[PDB]
Design a protein around this motif. Structure first.
Motif, PDB file in Angstrom:
ATOM      1  N   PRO A   5       0.799  -1.240   0.000  1.00 16.97           N
ATOM      2  CA  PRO A   5       0.000   0.000   0.000  1.00 16.97           C
ATOM      3  C   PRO A   5       0.822   1.275   0.000  1.00 16.97           C
ATOM      4  O   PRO A   5       0.381   2.270  -0.591  1.00 16.97           O
ATOM      5  CB  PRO A   5      -0.836  -0.120   1.280  1.00 16.97           C
ATOM      6  N   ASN A   6       1.980   1.286   0.665  1.00 18.51           N
ATOM      7  CA  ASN A   6       2.862   2.447   0.655  1.00 18.51           C
ATOM      8  C   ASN A   6       3.099   2.857  -0.795  1.00 18.51           C
ATOM      9  O   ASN A   6       3.445   2.028  -1.637  1.00 18.51           O
ATOM     10  CB  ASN A   6       4.164   2.119   1.408  1.00 18.51           C
ATOM     11  N   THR A   7       2.912   4.144  -1.081  1.00 24.58           N
ATOM     12  CA  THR A   7       2.968   4.664  -2.440  1.00 24.58           C
ATOM     13  C   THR A   7       4.358   4.718  -3.060  1.00 24.58           C
ATOM     14  O   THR A   7       4.450   4.878  -4.285  1.00 24.58           O
ATOM     15  CB  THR A   7       2.376   6.070  -2.447  1.00 24.58           C
ATOM     16  N   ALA A   8       5.430   4.577  -2.280  1.00 21.65           N
ATOM     17  CA  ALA A   8       6.776   4.765  -2.824  1.00 21.65           C
ATOM     18  C   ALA A   8       7.084   3.788  -3.957  1.00 21.65           C
ATOM     19  O   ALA A   8       7.519   4.193  -5.039  1.00 21.65           O
ATOM     20  CB  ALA A   8       7.808   4.632  -1.706  1.00 21.65           C
TER      21      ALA A   8
END
Ligand SMILES: CCCCCCCCCC(=O)OC[C@H]1O[C@H](O[C@]2(CO)O[C@H](CO)[C@@H](O)[C@@H]2O)[C@H](O)[C@@H](O)[C@@H]1O
Ligand SMILES: *[C@@]1(O)O[C@H](CO)[C@@H](O[C@@]2(O)O[C@H](CO)[C@@H](O)[C@H](O)[C@H]2NC(C)=O)[C@H](O)[C@H]1NC(C)=O
Ligand SMILES: CC(C)CCC[C@@H](C)[C@H]1CC[C@H]2[C@@H]3CC=C4C[C@@H](O)CC[C@]4(C)[C@H]3CC[C@]12C
Ligand SMILES: *[C@@]1(O)O[C@H](CO)[C@@H](O)[C@H](O)[C@H]1NC(C)=O
Ligand SMILES: *[C@@]1(O)O[C@H](CO)[C@@H](O)[C@H](O)[C@H]1NC(C)=O
Ligand code: BEF
Ligand SMILES: [Mg+2]
Ligand SMILES: [Mg+2]
Ligand SMILES: [Mg+2]
Lengths: 996, 291
Positions: A469-472
């Motif tokens: 889920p983290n956008t990076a």
């Protein structure tokens, strides 16, 4: 013939396990997978009875009453009571209108015991009463499949030769054999103390019946996985039931406290007979009638018997126990409280008793460094640094790879003490996150899985692959958890400080080196590796394979190793050291594997670091084990298999010539033999256990102890002490109290005893010199059972003279509760002064009303006559019978008072054995109060309206009160200087005699 | 277990001889020291009390009323014919009276004839040894009227209708007081009042009163009273062999071979009684002359 039945129970278990599948059938005639017919089942149920342990015989409440009414100390009092009536009977016929004094003594004596008894039983009831409050256990329905119809039945309804599906989370119904398995593991910890669940397999593994995985045991439960199997032993036939039956049918042993009473009783009567016999001799020499002489002997012996001491001891004993109950240390039997102090040697169990019986994260290895997680039940332990990103890249793997989650019901329950399904290893991992790395519930759903891999027997590995889920970096991520050797093959990169790095061989050695070290520690070792799965080379969306292996198995990014073990309890290590400080011997007995055990004793203080087991010496020299002499090894390990082929004599040798000592792979029966071997030394041994394996030892122990919740119910009952809080440290508190109460009893005993010398003395000279009777029988009662008690009780509250913990264990054949020395101090010297003062007061009064001491000789005869009424004094006045009697009564009363005044000093001096008054100081508030209670009471006893009518006790002229003041002060002076003289002189003769 | 007496060490009864001696010395010295103290305390107590007087006389405030033939149960039962039967009762009467003949009452200084009439109490100074050995008032056997009368009356006494006499307990300094002039509680059998202490006897119950026909008391002055002049007794040591006043009674038309009960009551202001001491200034007796 039960001694044989007991002996057969003592023998190590024997069973038949290895045989063809067909052969089990050829014995019990049941289809392997078809179950059985109902008709077959019905026949067996009559044949062997229901599947339940026979209840221990119920003991009626009324019976117990008599036990305290009899006992030992109570019995001594009885004969006195009886000997009052037997005396009174002789007296009744011979005398005309005889005095009712002797009769009164007897009724009161019996009443005291009956009260004391009634009081005692109230407490021993209250324990087993509230003990039933946590004995609210529940039946569990049996899971059964019959004739293929899958019909579950009640557990009692279970019969021999039947099929059973042991699904995960179902308790094992009864001891059974296994035909099919899907990795079900069982907790054999209760029966054989296996901390780690042991997997169950149909095939034979080891000769020892307990070890082989083919068989199953009662009071265990399938944790994870499932399996099926067929009955062998049921109900009483079950190994555990046999074990329990064994325990319940054993001898609770004589408790050390009451034994000191039994020796104490001997001395009391022993002086009494000598005094009485001597007096009987002198009485006859004095020409008095034979019949009268007998009465005299009985009276002296009777009055010599302590009266209220029984109540004082009982009350004192109960009080000490109460504080224990304040701190969740309960004793079913009142007597056992002192046992802890008396213990010279201990034997504790590993799992459930020291351990929390929960697999738990122990150590972690990240960035080529180790981080021992805090092992504490209560979370008091120190924590690792979490700054490095490697902790994150590590923690996520555990939180997601784990299969299950916490049960919904748990709410404010602490993180550590909350139940979870599935393998415990997974649970500990779920735990370690939940404490250290935030939460998991959200963390588990926040990264959305796609495909997971369950445990596979072939090509074992366990992995999954979720989304990011983290956008990076939206690329999906894959996580694999597995045994280190298998994992090593499938990983190349390693993440250090957030940078991927290749598999340099030196790092490979370090991972291997770490693996070896953790294995020696005994924690199960698990390795974690995660590599980002890119999205350019592999579609970001739907691109998965489950049958043909898609994703990169090899060349993943490794992160670290996490170790799991069953730690001790939070306060366990410090407590062990404290016990060792008292010179007490510490020994571990468990049925668990040596590997786990050795480290535990090293970590908890049983094994001092640097001491070498016979084996370590071999390893230190790369030489065969046989060569080294055993004496060189201060400590020794003993595997259970060897123990079987061992002779009582060898044990004795093994014990003395070692200190730190641990046994493992031991049967419960074998445990009991250890305790007896410790007992054969003639020393006092205690026992602490968690499971049913420990039930026999606790019983046959001088005193047994267990855990209030983490313990097995059978053992719970056998033990003489229950720890509700499961605070192992309470044992340390117990020894403190036990040594403490011991000394304070010595103190208490002396106070009431010294009183007897002045109590009895008048009665003696009264016969010898035919003088008016200086002290009434009724007044004695006001001392023995009236004034003196409240101090006698107060004495118990005395604080510690010095650090008792430093003191070594006393020796039961040496420093006995009541030595010849104590008698000398009280009966021999202080008492004589105590009595002397009373006579002085007695003489003063008579003189002050014109009855001169010189003139009082031989006056008894004409004195006690009820008709002569012109009795002349040295001043020459004439006196009526009642008047001169009123004087005697009013002369009895000061004797009672002076006794209190004189007893005042005793209360003080007997507050300390060695320290000066102010060295310890009068800090015991209850003691102080008693002083006033005793005084006020005495004063009232003389000045209430008509006490001279109801109790024949008249008021007192004011001078009399200060009559014996010099005497009492003198007593104080003598004792203080004496206790202070032995302070200066460490080994002087002063000590050998005066010190008590 | 019987090895305590001797061992390789040969401790006697489990104690070494040397220790045995050491305990003995200490015990002996301690016991000796203890005895010396106690005695010294007693010596003090001696010095507190003067020889002449007692320090507390509260418990003799109602004085006693003893008989002469002290009996195992104040009961007299005998044969008016058998000497052995009444011998015990009579035996004391003489050995008691032995110190009352004109023979002992010989030294003039020791014995002063108070008189033949009751008079004001003979106060004799203030108690001290500063004044000399004080004087005693004489008492004649003849004052008894035909009871122990010698030439006049038979020594028999208990041949029939026996005499009985009452003695007031000697009390230091006691000053007897005449009964109140108000006579509501005073049954006046005797006319004389000022210098005589009234003594009267009566049957225990109304039936007893009927049983006893009559009684006669004989005394100095022909009155049933003690001599006021005689008192106050001033010390047994101070007045060695001081003679107590004696009063007697006799019975007439009694009912023989039948137990009957008699009560003798002293009267006067400074006399009390107790329902718990029958002898506390009161007097009871059971008497049976069986033939
Ligand atoms: C006279 C009979 C008793 C003598 C006495 O008991 O006095 C000492 C008292 O003094 C106490 O306090 C302590 C005891 O801790 O005593 C010393 C006082 O100088 C000091 O060592 C410490 O402060 C408390 O009042 C009492 O309980 C204690 O009896
Ligand atoms: C004295 O005790 O006893 C004599 C008798 O021994 C009494 O003098 C008869 O007994 O009494 C009447 C008078 O009461 C005379 O008439 C007779 O002569 C008496 N007989 C003899 C033999 O003396 C006398 O009464 C009595 N005295 C007292 C005081 O009781
Ligand atoms: C040296 C000091 C400490 C004490 C020595 C004891 C001696 C000398 C003293 C101390 C207390 C005293 C006694 C205390 C009380 C009484 C009761 C009274 O009705 C008469 C005096 C008498 C009987 C005293 C006798 C003398 C006595 C025994
Ligand atoms: C007496 O009190 O009363 C008599 C009158 O009945 C009288 O004769 C007698 O003298 C009185 N004596 C005294 C001392 O009062
Ligand atoms: C005598 O007392 O009582 C007789 C009745 O039992 C009576 O006949 C007789 O007169 C009485 N004698 C005297 C002396 O009173
Ligand atoms: F490990 Be113990 F024996 F339960
Ligand atoms: Mg255990
Ligand atoms: Mg026990
Ligand atoms: Mg006693």
């Amino acid at each position: 013939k039960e001694r044989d039945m007991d002996e057969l129970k003592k023998e190590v278990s024997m069973d038949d396990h290895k045989l063809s599948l067909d052969e089990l059938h050829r014995k019990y005639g049941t289809d392997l997978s078809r179950g059985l017919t109902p008709a077959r089942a019905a026949e067996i149920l009559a044949r062997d009875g229901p599947n339940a342990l026979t209840p221990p015989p119920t003991t009626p409440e009324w019976v117990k009453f008599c036990r305290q009414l009899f006992g030992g100390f109570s019995m001594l009092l009885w004969i006195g009571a009886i000997l009052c009536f037997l005396a009174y009977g002789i007296q009744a016929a011979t005398e005309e209108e005889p005095q009712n004094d002797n009769l009164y003594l007897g009724v009161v004596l019996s009443a005291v015991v009956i009260i004391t008894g009634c009081f005692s039983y109230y407490q021993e009831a209250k324990s087993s009463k509230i003990m039933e409050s946590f004995k609210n256990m529940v039946p569990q329905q049996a899971l059964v499949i019959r004739n293929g119809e899958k019909m579950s039945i009640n557990a009692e309804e279970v019969v021999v030769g039947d099929l059973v599906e042991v699904k995960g989370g179902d308790r094992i119904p009864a001891d059974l054999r296994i035909i099919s398995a899907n990795g079900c593991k069982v907790d054999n910890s209760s029966l054989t103390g296996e901390s780690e669940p042991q997997t169950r397999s149909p095939d034979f593994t080891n000769e020892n019946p307990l070890e082989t995985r083919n068989i199953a045991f009662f009071s265990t439960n399938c944790v994870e996985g499932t399996a099926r199997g067929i009955v062998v032993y049921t109900g009483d036939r079950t190994v555990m039931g046999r074990i329990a039956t064994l325990a319940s049918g054993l001898e609770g042993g004589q408790t050390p406290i009451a034994a000191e009473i039994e020796h104490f009783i001997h001395i009391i009567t022993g002086v009494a007979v000598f005094l009485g016999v001597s007096f009987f001799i002198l009485s006859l020499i004095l020409e008095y009638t034979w019949l009268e002489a007998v009465i005299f002997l009985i009276g002296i012996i009777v009055a010599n018997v302590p009266e209220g001491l029984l109540a004082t001891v009982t009350v004192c004993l109960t009080l000490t126990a109460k504080r224990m109950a304040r701190k969740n240390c309960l004793v079913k039997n009142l007597e056992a409280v002192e046992t802890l102090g008396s213990t010279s040697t201990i034997c504790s169990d590993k799992t459930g008793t020291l351990t929390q019986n929960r697999m738990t994260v122990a150590h972690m290895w990240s960035d080529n460094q180790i981080h021992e997680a805090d092992t504490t039940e209560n979370q008091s332990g120190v924590s690792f640094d979490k700054t490095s990103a490697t902790w994150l890249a590590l923690s996520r793997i555990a939180g997601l790879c784990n299969r299950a989650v916490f049960q919904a019901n748990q709410e404010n329950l602490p993180i550590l003490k909350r139940a979870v399904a599935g393998d415990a290893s997974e649970s500990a991992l779920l735990k370690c996150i939940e404490l250290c790395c935030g939460s998991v519930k959200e963390m588990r759903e926040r990264y959305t899985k796609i495909v997971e891999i369950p445990f596979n027997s072939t090509n074992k590995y366990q992995l999954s692959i979720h989304k990011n889920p983290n956008t990076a970096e939206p690329r999906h991520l894959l996580v694999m958890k597995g045994a280190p050797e298998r994992i090593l093959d499938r990983c190349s990169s390693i993440l250090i400080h957030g940078k991927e790095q290749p598999l340099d061989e030196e790092l490979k050695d370090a991972f291997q080196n770490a693996y070896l070290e953790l294995g020696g520690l005994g924690e199960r070792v698990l390795g974690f590796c995660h590599l980002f799965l890119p999205d350019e080379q592999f579609p970001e969306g739907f691109q998965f394979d489950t049958d043909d292996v898609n994703f990169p198995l090899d060349n993943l990014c490794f992160v670290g190793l996490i170790s799991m073990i069953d730690p001790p309890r939070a306060a366990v290590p410090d407590a062990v050291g404290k016990c060792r400080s008292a010179g007490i011997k510490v020994i571990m007995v468990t049925g668990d594997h040596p590997i786990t055990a050795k480290a535990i004793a090293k970590g908890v203080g049983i094994i001092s670091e640097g001491n070498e087991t016979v084996e370590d010496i071999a390893a230190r020299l790369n030489i065969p084990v046989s060569q080294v002499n055993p004496r060189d090894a201060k400590a020794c390990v003993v595997h259970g298999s060897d123990l079987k082929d061992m002779t009582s004599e060898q044990l004795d040798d093994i014990l003395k010539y070692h200190t730190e000592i641990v046994f493992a792979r031991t049967s419960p029966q074998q445990k009991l033999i250890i305790v007896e071997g410790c007992q054969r030394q003639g020393a006092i041994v205690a026992v602490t256990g968690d499971g049913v394996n420990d039930s026999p030892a606790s019983k046959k122990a001088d005193i047994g102890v267990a855990m209030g919740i983490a313990g097995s119910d059978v053992s719970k009952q056998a033990a003489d002490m229950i720890l509700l809080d499961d605070n192992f440290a309470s044992i340390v508190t117990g020894v403190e109290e036990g040594r403490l109460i011991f000394d304070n009893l010595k103190k208490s005993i002396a106070y009431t005893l010294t009183s007897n010398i002045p109590e009895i003395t008048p009665f003696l000279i009264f016969i010898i010199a035919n003088i008016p009777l200086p002290l009434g029988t009724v007044t004695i009662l006001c001392i023995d059972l009236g004034t003196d008690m409240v101090p006698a009780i107060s004495l118990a509250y005395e604080q510690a003279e010095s650090d008792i913990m430093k003191r070594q264990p006393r020796n039961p054949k040496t420093d006995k509760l009541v030595n010849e020395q104590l008698i000398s101090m009280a009966y021999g010297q202080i008492g004589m002064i105590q009595a002397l003062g009373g006579f002085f007061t007695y003489f003063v009064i008579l003189a002050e009303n014109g009855f001169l001491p010189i003139h009082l000789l031989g006056l008894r005869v004409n004195w006690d006559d009820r008709w002569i009424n012109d009795v002349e004094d040295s001043y020459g006045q004439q006196w009526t019978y009642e008047q001169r009697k009123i004087v005697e009564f009013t002369c009895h009363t000061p004797f009672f008072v002076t006794i209190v005044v004189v007893q005042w000093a005793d209360l003080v001096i007997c507050k300390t054995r060695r320290n000066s008054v102010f060295q310890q100081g009068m800090k015991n508030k209850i003691l102080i109060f008693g002083l006033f209670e005793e005084t006020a009471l005495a004063a009232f006893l003389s000045y209430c309206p008509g006490m001279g009518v109801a109790l024949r006790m008249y008021p007192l002229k004011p001078t009399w009160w200060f009559c014996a003041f010099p005497y009492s002060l003198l007593i104080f002076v003598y004792d203080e200087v004496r206790k202070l003289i032995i302070r200066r002189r460490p080994g002087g003769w002063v000590e050998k005699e005066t010190y008590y | 277990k019987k090895f305590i007496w001797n061992s390789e060490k040969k401790e006697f009864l489990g104690r070494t001889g040397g220790s045995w001696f050491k305990i003995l010395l200490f015990y002996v010295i301690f016991y000796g020291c203890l005895a010396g103290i106690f005695i010294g305390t007693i010596q003090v107590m001696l010095l507190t009390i003067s020889e002449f007087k007692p320090t507390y006389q509260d418990r003799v405030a109602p004085p006693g009323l003893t008989q002469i033939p002290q009996s195992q149960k104040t009961e007299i039962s005998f044969r008016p014919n058998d000497p052995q039967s009444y011998e015990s009762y009579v035996v004391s009467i003489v050995r008691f009276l032995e110190k009352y003949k004109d023979l002992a009452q010989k030294d003039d200084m020791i014995f002063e004839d108070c008189g033949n009439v009751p008079s004001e109490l003979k106060e004799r100074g203030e108690y001290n040894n500063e004044r000399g050995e004080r004087k005693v008032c004489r008492f004649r056997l003849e004052w008894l009227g035909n009871c122990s009368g010698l030439n006049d009356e038979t020594y028999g006494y208990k041949d029939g209708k026996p005499c009985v006499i009452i003695k007031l307990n000697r009390v230091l300094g006691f000053k007897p007081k005449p009964p109140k002039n108000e006579s509501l509680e005073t049954y006046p059998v005797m006319k004389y009042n000022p210098y005589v202490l009234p003594v009267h006897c009566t049957g225990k119950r109304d039936e007893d009163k009927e049983k006893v026909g009559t009684m006669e008391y004989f005394g100095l002055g022909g009155y049933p009273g003690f001599p006021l002049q005689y008192y106050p007794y001033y010390g047994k040591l101070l007045q060695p062999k001081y003679l107590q006043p004696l009063m007697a009674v006799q019975f007439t038309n009694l009912t023989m071979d039948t137990e009957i009960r008699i009560e003798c009551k002293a009267y006067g202001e400074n006399i009390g009684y107790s329902e718990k001491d029958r002898f506390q200034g009161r007097f009871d007796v059971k008497i049976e002359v069986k033939s």
